[PDB]
């Protein structure tokens, strides 16, 4: 329900990655699935992610963040990888399951 639908927006702002201009998916730990997922991203999405991240690291080494204006807004955050990552995991679970059978 629209209850935690608020909690989320709260956590999202509590987290603070949007202050670096990073999308939620930009902050994912690159394990095996995430790595495969990233290989499937379209060139443009991939290069944008790259700049966003390189930018964040530069802000981090400088000990600065983006001006309040540039912060990613909860509702404008692009879940650009979740779709691919979801597929990668199913495929994997399919194989795992099948290899047992």
């Amino acid at each position: 329900g629209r209850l935690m639908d608020r909690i989320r927006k709260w956590y999202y702002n509590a987290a603070g990655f949007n202050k670096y201009g990073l999308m939620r998916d930009d902050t994912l730990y690159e394990d095996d699935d995430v790595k495969e997922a990233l290989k499937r991203l379209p060139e443009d999405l991939y290069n944008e992610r790259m700049f966003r991240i390189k930018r964040a690291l530069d802000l981090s080494l400088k000990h600065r963040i983006l001006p309040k204006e540039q912060w990613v807004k909860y509702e404008e955050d692009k879940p650009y990888l979740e779709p691919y990552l979801k597929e990668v995991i199913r495929e994997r679970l399919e194989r795992e399951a099948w290899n047992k059978k």
């Binding site: 909690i7 999202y12 730990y29 991240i53 964040a56 690291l57 981090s60």
Partner: protein
């Protein structure tokens, strides 16, 4: 090859680990502790050898050989001070090194993490046996208290202990073997440290944002060679200020008294860096349970890599985990404090609470809050 820094079979190693080695552009000051630990180690070994050249491992001469060193050897007092206080600088640095890794999920580098736990266990053993050498009151009693705990292991109890002592109590044959061990272990530490860095170089360093820094890497030199040198003097100042202006601030006055097997000191307590574990020890009334709880207080570190639930590496963007992290740190100051207090009310109950919350936070809360936060990110 063009430059001899890459071709040569040795420089090539010095280059691929201290000069042309790719480092994240955004690593903070928490990444300065590895090098300090390395420098810390080179300094202990150095001051240790200088002291060893005047020490005599015999119950009848240990105490005075140390006194002779301080009183007659040129700068013996300085070396003794530096070595003794260096042990603390070493632990301060190591706890901050460990903290940093827990807070930034560096432990996901399993082998680097495990060798690191081994380094810590070896460092402890070293400091433990090193502490006995001066053969003062806390030296002997500490040895006595702790080594007796193990006679509580069923069956191989009294056996393992009497074997370790080389007799029926902590006596001369213990001192001499402890000196050999104290001289030996630091070299094992130096060796394992090489392995630590070898596994580390497999992946390279993790960074504060916990995301891939391949997009922005800089050569270790001059960025980190300078950053680390600076970090050396910044820490080295409080160190020397302590070893020169307050030499005995951290030491037990009880150790300025020759060991005496017929006089138990009133308060047998360890050095600050062991207090937290001593607290957990006494929290479990039951010789066997306390020993296990003691052991586990450090062995727990081997489990961290398996209790990671977050979808993100660090705790930078995880507010709930962040407070849980500082609760833990506070938890440890409490245990440290409890450890230095007598075993009485209210300290006893507070002790059991802090010991109990210590394990709860690492075994139960951290993995739980981590999962919770994954849901709050809609993952």
């Amino acid at each position: 090859a063009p430059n001899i820094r890459k071709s040569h079979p040795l420089l090539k190693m010095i280059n691929n680990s201290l000069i042309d080695l790719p480092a994240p552009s955004n690593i903070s000051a928490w990444w300065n502790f590895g090098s300090l630990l390395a420098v810390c180690l080179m300094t202990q070994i150095l001051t240790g050898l200088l002291l060893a050249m005047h020490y005599t491992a015999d119950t009848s001469l240990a105490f005075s050989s140390v006194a002779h060193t301080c009183r007659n050897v040129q700068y013996g007092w300085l070396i003794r001070n530096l070595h003794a206080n260096g042990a603390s600088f070493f632990f301060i640095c190591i706890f901050l090194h460990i903290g940093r890794g827990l807070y930034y999920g560096s432990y996901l580098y399993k082998e680097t993490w495990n060798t690191g736990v081994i380094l810590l266990l070896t460092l402890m053993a070293t400091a433990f046996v090193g502490y006995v050498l001066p053969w003062g009151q806390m030296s002997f009693w500490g040895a006595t208290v702790i080594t007796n705990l193990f006679s509580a292991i069923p069956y191989i109890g009294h056996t393992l202990v009497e074997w370790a002592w080389g007799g029926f109590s902590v006596d001369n044959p213990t001192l001499t073997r402890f000196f050999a061990l104290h001289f030996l272990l630091p070299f094992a530490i130096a060796g394992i440290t090489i392995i630590h860095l070898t596994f580390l170089h497999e992946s390279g360093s993790n960074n504060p944002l916990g995301i891939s820094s391949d997009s922005d890497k800089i050569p270790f030199h001059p960025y980190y060679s300078f950053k680390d040198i600076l970090g050396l003097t910044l820490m080295l100042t409080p160190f020397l200020t302590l070893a020169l202006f307050s030499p005995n601030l951290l030491g037990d006055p009880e150790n300025f008294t020759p060991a005496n097997p017929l006089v138990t000191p009133p308060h047998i307590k360890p050095e600050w860096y062991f207090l937290f574990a001593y607290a957990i020890l006494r929290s479990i009334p039951n010789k066997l349970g306390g020993v296990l709880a003691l052991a586990a207080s450090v062995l727990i570190l081997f489990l961290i890599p398996f209790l990671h639930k977050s979808k993100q590496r660090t705790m930078t963007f995880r507010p709930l985990s962040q407070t849980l992290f500082w609760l833990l740190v506070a938890n440890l100051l409490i245990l440290t404090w409890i450890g230095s207090q007598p075993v009485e009310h209210p300290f006893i109950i507070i002790g059991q609470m802090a010991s109990l919350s210590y394990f709860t936070i690492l075994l139960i809360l951290f993995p739980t809050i981590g999962t919770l936060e994954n849901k709050m990110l809609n993952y």
